[PDB]
């Protein structure tokens, strides 16, 4: 049903149609509406559900939504459209072929590379990497490493790793050398779940020929070391349909009796409770803690401990209470001031794009008035900005 139709742009409705879809959602652009008696309806050959393949002979079978909207608005008074009424290995090969063409183009076509990779799931990017190596005999990561540069290179190479590989390599990078990036180490260890950590530990073993727990011990000290080792084990309790109200109250008293009530801090009891109890349980514990203590769990942490141990406890409680808001706040910090903390911004957008990016955007918009898309737009430029915007998934 490959039909080629010429529409005449008219003041009453323009082209007289609506379109939905686009390669940013990995779907073909499809005619959404056809306003009756207007241009698209007058032709008699356009129907709701037609996939848009060409605009004035310009191929758009793999174009984004804005690219097709931009073509249809600049095609003149006479617009000619060619229409026709599960991710497979074919899609991987076509994606891998287009990425190969964009890399071999003189000057590198970064737009095409960003259009595809930032709009595929992590599992689909592995299928693309498998097909790219079959067709070119080259590794896609190393090909893009020399073809790209700057922040865009950091995003694309990070997107190519599996969730465990990316987390493991980021963990290794935070402890590399004498200067341990405690903030990056804290962000990953406090926010990852049991299933994610068990996979990180397994992959960290393969990539670096040593245990993650053994490397944490070598770069951390004191109670901060005990907190990261216990969290990195990923043996937190899994909650069921059992709300143990008696334990919620006793855990709150124990947290209060171990900190604000006594001189000093019984941090082993803090580490024991906050790392072993399930997340839904600890959420109700922290509210029950407000009934016994004049300060909430976060303020009690600021009053009891200092240094990296304070920073880790502050991040853990935020992840337990509201993890999407936790990432929304860290994204805002990465862009609020002069310049950009690109390491945090890139890592969050890469690691959370497929997890809870919608809930992060919802918390961000509610608290900061503007969208996460908007702040990314004002802090980054170029294809690096477009890649982050695609990982954001849309405005608001």
């Amino acid at each position: 049903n490959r039909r080629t139709v010429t529409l005449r742009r008219q003041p009453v409705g323009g082209l007289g149609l609506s379109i939905k879809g686009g390669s940013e959602h990995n779907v073909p652009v499809v005619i959404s509406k056809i306003f009756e008696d207007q241009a698209a309806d007058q032709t008699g050959m356009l129907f709701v559900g037609d996939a848009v393949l060409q605009v004035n002979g310009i191929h758009v079978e793999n174009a984004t939504h804005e690219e097709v909207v931009h073509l249809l608005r600049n095609a003149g008074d006479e617009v000619t459209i060619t229409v026709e009424y599960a991710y497979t290995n074919f899609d991987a090969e076509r994606d891998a072929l287009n990425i190969e063409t964009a890399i071999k183009t003189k000057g590198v076509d970064e737009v095409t590379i960003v259009n595809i990779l930032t709009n595929r799931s992590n599992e689909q990017r592995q299928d693309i990497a498998f097909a790219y190596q079959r067709r070119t005999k080259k590794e896609l990561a190393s090909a893009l490493k020399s073809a790209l540069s700057g922040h865009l290179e950091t995003v694309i190479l990070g997107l190519l790793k599996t969730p465990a590989q990316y987390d493991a390599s980021e963990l290794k990078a935070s402890m590399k050398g004498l200067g341990t990036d405690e903030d990056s180490l804290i962000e990953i260890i406090c926010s990852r779940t049991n299933q994610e950590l068990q996979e990180i530990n397994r992959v960290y073993k393969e990539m670096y020929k040593t245990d993650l727990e053994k490397d944490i011990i070598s770069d951390t000290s004191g109670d901060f070391r005990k907190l990261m080792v216990a969290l990195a084990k990923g043996r937190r309790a899994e909650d069921g349909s059992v709300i143990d109200y008696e334990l919620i109250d006793q855990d709150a008293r124990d947290l209060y009796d171990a900190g604000v009530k006594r001189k000093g801090t019984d941090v082993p009891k803090w580490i024991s409770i906050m790392t072993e109890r399930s997340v839904p349980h600890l959420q109700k514990v922290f509210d029950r803690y407000k009934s016994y203590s004049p300060y909430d769990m976060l303020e009690s942490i600021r009053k009891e401990v200092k240094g990296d141990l304070e920073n880790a406890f502050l991040n853990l409680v935020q992840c337990i209470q509201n993890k999407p808001l936790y990432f929304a706040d860290r994204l805002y910090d990465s862009m609020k001031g002069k310049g950009t903390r690109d390491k945090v911004l890139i890592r969050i957008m890469v690691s959370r794009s497929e997890v809870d990016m919608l809930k992060i955007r919802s918390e961000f918009k509610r608290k900061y008035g503007k969208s996460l898309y908007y702040y990314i737009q004002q802090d980054t430029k170029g294809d690096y900005q477009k890649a982050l915007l695609y990982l954001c998934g849309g405005d608001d």
């Binding site: 149609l17 609506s18 379109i19 306003f35 939504h65 909207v69 608005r73 849309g394």
Partner: peptide
């Protein structure tokens, strides 16, 4: 996700 033209 639709745009009218």
């Amino acid at each position: 996700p639709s745009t009218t033209l």
